Design a protein around this ligand. Structure first.
Ligand SMILES: O=C1O[C@H](CO)[C@H](O)[C@H](O)[C@H]1O
Ligand SMILES: [Mg+2]
Ligand SMILES: [Mg+2]
Ligand SMILES: [Mg+2]
Ligand code: NA
Ligand code: NA
Ligand code: NA
Ligand code: NA
Ligand code: NA
Lengths: 1011, 204
């Protein structure tokens, strides 16, 4: 029997799914959630052996340890130990598409463990083994006897070992197959690995046991009263003296309790469930659960005898909350939610897909600290601890079934086939049975990218019938099918339609009002954060706030799926698709996160934090209006700091406590501001600070900020002109300007400033020239698959138009002497095989004060693709430690992604002006800069810029950051204008029209001088 | 207008005049205009204009130049959007081409007089022996902006001596979503803070 090639067999002898058990034999331990002697962990060192196929496994392995086997740590993915390579493929299946068959060469992982079992465990009760996660299928043996089989890599598989174990030493034999018919339902865009990657444990339960229990909470209209209903099921011999007691606790206070014998109410002509009982507890003024205030009660379920003898106890945290869709709005406790969510894969650069508490807590802390209140389990049920953490820290969770058949053609080929309904149903029903008691889970998902099949409709209804307390969503087949309560598109844009046939992605604003449509819309995926991205993120939030039924979305995604490799010196570097010899592969498409794999933040994270702020501000005269977007809590841990500065120079500041009710407003009247003397623009900056530490943040945590331009006093007082007069020296090949001991050299053949001298010191390694290109960002390349090129991508258009090959042609170069300065005028034409792409006309004016004023006017042929940038660049000889500037910062910011950046005087080390994206590209830009300082140089004007030891050429020629090498001097790119980075998706042009350089004619001016 | 600078330099084949003015109101500098006039041996005068607009003053209705020409010609010929009156937020109907109309058609007789007759996206304008080249907005008539705003009825207007020319580098939208509250959309308001435009004036 090749059970792993039969969608009809998803398991053999596997026990029924259920909520987290621990089988406590002490009620107090159950209440306080202390460890249970009845739940043993089998994690640790195991024996492992790798085989090319299951037919290669020796039978002697069932009873004796293989001498060639290694001793490895479990849980783990065997690819992370180097037994075989992990594969990164997006859509295309890693195996030939021929369901339900898999490759004959099926990597097989033979795990084995010799452990001790105490006689007390076998003399009575039931001893089961629990595998929280095995990828992708496996057969289990105990002391040589076959126990069972299991599929679905993301849910626990349990087996009764009571009749297989012996007092003392026992040995488990687990044969894990990398590929199985289950793999056809696990085509998620992520590294394809395998093995026993989640916890393994032993649970002892009494023969007479609690086999399942469901907790529900319903309320009255104002949520001032609630009823906690707990249905309890038992297995074992029924006796009239058996009883079930359910008590509800708040901290150490019991607030309610109910007891009753087994025997449910009449259900049909045949009576009712004699092996079940439902307890109902009344709760007055319950403390409600939300991501804002995660109030939790504890429910303890005791199985006992009428005379008080405890049999066993189970328990769970209870969050009193109601989730419902009413009048087209998703409501939590009666209020319309605004989902500041993100998609999160379980990924670790070193451990692969094995999750640990520390990494989970780190993620939740960063998420909340960056204003996220929701997470989607893309695209499978997570490690069980994840939900416990979300319940307690407070995050709304979308629990998703492990079903994705993206590589099928059409996408619904399997999901519309009744032959696959059983396999799919188990991935859905077992998830619900496992996580239905977690308050953090507010929405169920049928999976992802599997088209829309009849199987989805059947399973959608099954959930609606089994658990009415949570909406069900599913994006497949158009995002608005009959299988979803919420319009949940992926990468649908704000204003622009993408009318694809059959499954169009309408502008989200337009989608809401299509004839007959009334459901709420929450993007299950949007703002693809691949590399330098998240351009246009602000456009989504303006819309979310203006439209009631646009209730947010989940950013794609949280963390880069990069893996660690080491060079010959043992130095680790970040790897992506194809770096393990895996092929076919989709290269860097596995890295789409807001944070690096080690959880170091990408610049985009700050943009998300700012746009997802919970406090909104408006300024009118000298009054600040603060509006709270909290639904349940008052601002009882917030104070508003305000400061006014003239061109970075502090003028006045102060604090004002915030006392705003949820959804309320507070008006703050700023004091009298002492009008500054010197000219300049006054900037007002306000920030919300949390004085008190919380479970998720340190005291002083900044949760929101905003800036406004106040009064501006234009400089009218002309500066005292120096007495010195620059001198012009003309030769056939150059125009040299001399002031004191300073020299400016303009090449007459090229028409560019080729060199500058400060006495005997040279200032340039490369001439100052115009630049219209940028090392392509992942969004510029636009490809979700390594093998699929694209003539429509920005990079291909630029390349085809000859932008990267454009050669400068000098049209004019003249020099004139003025009364107090030398004027250099030049004109260049950039052409490609006869076609003029751009024309640059410049004038350099050097005065007696040593200042060089550069005026640049550029013409861009209307028929050439809009250029990535319009500026100048040069390689400076100097290498300074710090970079100081008056402008937007401190972090990297681009035109369509600079709302989070603030105008002020920033000063960082050179290294911070470079963003280490694993896949190198244009990076580190800072916009709206009026002054830049580096070494002996100072540039003034109104430009965007980036500065580093890497030229645009190396960046675009290098595939990995660890392969980059600092160049001589420092590369400076000063742009009068720079194109948006885009990001609505990373596989089609996504830069909005207003952020494309399509004006045809541009003007910008810079002043270069020493300091 | 308060003069801040006015210099003149002699170049190889041209004369360069540089100026700078500041428009103030009760000590408040509203605008700053910096220009250069380059007159070469071909007789062409290249005018470069860079304006600064106080971020806190209400966004200006336009940023351009004006003068009353002594010439009074029968026709107006231009290469730009037309043939009819069109403004930044009302120019989709206009087409780019070579238009030629009698001076009178360059004035829209709104019963209540106001700024009128503007034509946008113009690269070349011809009036009498004059030619202006660049990328500008313009309106031309026998009525000054002053008379138009001081006059309540169109039948009360009187042709002034010569022809008033308004050449704008930029011009605010006219709005209209309603006529009793600001209706000009942000994208058509002159809020950039700094503006640049260049024009070439010569004789044909
Ligand atoms: O639509 C999607 O786009 C992402 C692109 O990185 C990723 O593949 C997600 O798993 C998938 O749901
Ligand atoms: Mg099977
Ligand atoms: Mg997919
Ligand atoms: Mg612990
Ligand atoms: Na909304
Ligand atoms: Na991806
Ligand atoms: Na407060
Ligand atoms: Na690159
Ligand atoms: Na009038």
């Amino acid at each position: 029997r090749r059970d792993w090639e039969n969608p009809g067999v998803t398991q053999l002898n596997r026990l029924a799914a259920h909520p987290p058990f621990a089988s406590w034999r002490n009620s107090e331990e159950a209440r306080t959630d202390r460890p249970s002697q009845q739940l043993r962990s089998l994690n640790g060192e195991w024996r492992f052996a790798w085989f090319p196929a299951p037919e290669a496994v020796p039978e002697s392995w069932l009873e004796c340890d293989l001498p060639e086997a290694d001793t490895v740590v479990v849980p783990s993915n065997w690819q992370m130990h180097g037994y075989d390579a992990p594969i990164y493929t997006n859509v295309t299946y890693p195996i030939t598409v021929n369901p339900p068959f898999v490759p004959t060469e099926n990597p097989t992982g033979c795990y084995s463990l010799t452990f001790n079992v105490d006689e007390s465990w076998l003399q009575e009760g039931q001893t089961r083994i629990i595998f929280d996660g095995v990828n992708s299928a496996f057969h289990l043996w105990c002391n040589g006897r076959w126990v069972g089989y299991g599929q679905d890599s993301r849910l626990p598989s349990e087996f009764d070992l009571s009749a297989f174990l012996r007092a003392g030493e026992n040995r488990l034999a687990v044969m894990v197959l990398r590929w199985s018919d289950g793999s056809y339902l696990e085509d998620q865009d992520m590294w394809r690995m395998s093995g026993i990657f989640r916890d393994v444990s032993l649970l002892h339960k009494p023969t007479t046991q609690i086999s399942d229990f469901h907790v529900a909470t319903r309320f009255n209209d104002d949520f001032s009263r609630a009823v906690l209903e707990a249905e309890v099921q038992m297995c074992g011999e029924l006796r009239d003296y058996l009883r079930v007691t359910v008590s509800l606790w708040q901290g150490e206070t019991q607030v309610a309790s109910g007891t009753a014998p087994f025997g449910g109410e009449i259900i049909d002509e045949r009576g009712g469930y004699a092996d079940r009982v439902t307890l109902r507890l009344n709760v007055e003024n319950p403390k409600l659960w939300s991501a804002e205030i995660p109030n939790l009660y504890r429910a303890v379920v005791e199985l006992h005898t009428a005379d008080g003898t405890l049999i066993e106890a189970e328990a769970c945290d209870v969050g009193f909350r109601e989730v419902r869709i009413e009048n087209g709005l998703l409501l939590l406790n009666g209020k319309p939610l605004l989902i500041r969510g993100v998609n999160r894969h379980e990924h670790h650069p070193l451990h692969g897909q094995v999750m640990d508490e520390q990494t989970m807590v780190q993620d939740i802390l960063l998420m909340k600290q960056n204003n996220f209140n929701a997470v989607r389990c893309s695209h499978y049920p997570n490690h069980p601890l994840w939900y416990t953490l979300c319940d307690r820290y407070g995050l709304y969770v979308v629990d998703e079934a492990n079903i994705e058949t993206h590589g099928m053609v059409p996408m619904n080929r399997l999901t519309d086939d009744p032959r696959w309904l059983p396999a799919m149903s188990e991935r859905v029903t077992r998830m619900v049975q496992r996580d239905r008691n977690h308050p953090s889970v507010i929405i169920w998902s049928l999976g992802t990218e599997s088209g829309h099949g009849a199987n989805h409709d059947a399973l959608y209804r099954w959930i609606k019938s089994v658990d009415p307390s949570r909406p069900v969503q599913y994006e497949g087949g158009g995002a608005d099918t009959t299988a979803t309560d919420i319009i949940c598109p992926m990468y649908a844009r704000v204003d622009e339609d993408q009318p694809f046939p059959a499954v169009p992605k309408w502008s989200i604003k337009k989608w809401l009002s299509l004839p007959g449509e009334t459901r709420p819309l929450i993007l299950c995926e949007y703002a693809h954060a691949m590399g330098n991205s998240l351009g246009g993120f602000a456009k989504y939030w303006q819309a979310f706030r203006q439209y009631p039924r646009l209730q947010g979305g989940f950013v794609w995604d949280w963390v880069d799926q990069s893996l660690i490799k080491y060079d010959e010196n043992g130095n680790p570097w970040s790897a992506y698709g194809g770096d393990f010899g895996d092929t076919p592969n989709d290269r860097q498409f596995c890295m789409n996160g807001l944070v690096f794999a080690d959880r170091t933040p990408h610049p985009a994270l700050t943009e998300a934090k700012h746009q997802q702020q919970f406090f909104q501000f408006r300024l009118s005269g000298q009054t600040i209006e603060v509006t709270s977007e909290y639904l349940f809590r008052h601002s009882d841990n917030e104070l508003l700091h305000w400061m006014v500065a003239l061109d970075g120079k502090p003028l006045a500041s102060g604090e004002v406590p915030l006392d705003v009710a949820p959804q309320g407003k507070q008006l703050i009247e700023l004091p009298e501001l002492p009008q500054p003397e010197s000219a300049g623009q006054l900037w007002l900056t306000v920030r919300v600070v949390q004085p008190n530490a919380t479970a998720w943040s340190e005291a002083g945590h900044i949760s929101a900020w905003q800036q406004w331009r106040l009064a501006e006093n234009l400089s009218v007082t002309l500066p005292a002109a120096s007495h010195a007069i620059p001198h012009l020296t003309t030769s056939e090949m150059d125009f040299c300007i001399e002031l004191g001991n300073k020299r400016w050299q303009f090449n007459r053949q090229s028409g560019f400033l080729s060199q500058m001298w400060i006495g005997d010191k040279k200032q340039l390694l490369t001439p100052l020239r115009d630049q219209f290109t940028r090392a392509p960002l992942d969004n510029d390349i636009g490809v979700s698959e390594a093998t699929r090129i694209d003539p429509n991508a920005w990079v291909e258009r630029w390349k085809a138009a000859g932008h990267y090959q454009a050669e400068a042609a000098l049209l004019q170069c003249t020099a004139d002497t003025l009364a107090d300065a030398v004027l250099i005028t030049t004109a260049h034409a950039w052409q490609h095989q006869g076609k003029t792409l751009f024309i640059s006309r410049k004038t350099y004016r050097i005065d007696g004060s040593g200042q060089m004023a550069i005026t640049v006017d550029v013409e861009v042929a209307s028929d050439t693709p809009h250029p990535a940038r319009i500026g100048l660049n040069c390689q400076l000889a100097q290498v300074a430690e710090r970079v100081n500037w008056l402008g937007l910062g401190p972090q990297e910011n681009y035109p369509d992604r600079l709302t989070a950046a603030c105008f002020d005087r920033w000063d960082l080390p050179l290294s911070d002006m470079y963003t280490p994206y694993v896949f190198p590209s244009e990076n580190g830009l800072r916009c709206g800069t009026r002054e830049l300082n580096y070494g002996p140089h100072q540039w003034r004007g109104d430009f965007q810029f980036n500065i580093s030891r890497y030229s645009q050429q190396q960046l675009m020629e290098t595939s990995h950051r660890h392969l980059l090498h600092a160049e001589e001097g420092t590369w400076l790119n000063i742009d009068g204008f720079h194109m948006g980075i885009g990001g609505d998706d990373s596989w089609s042009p996504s830069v909005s029209a207003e952020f494309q350089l399509s004006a045809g004619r541009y003007h910008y001016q810079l002043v270069w001088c020493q300091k």
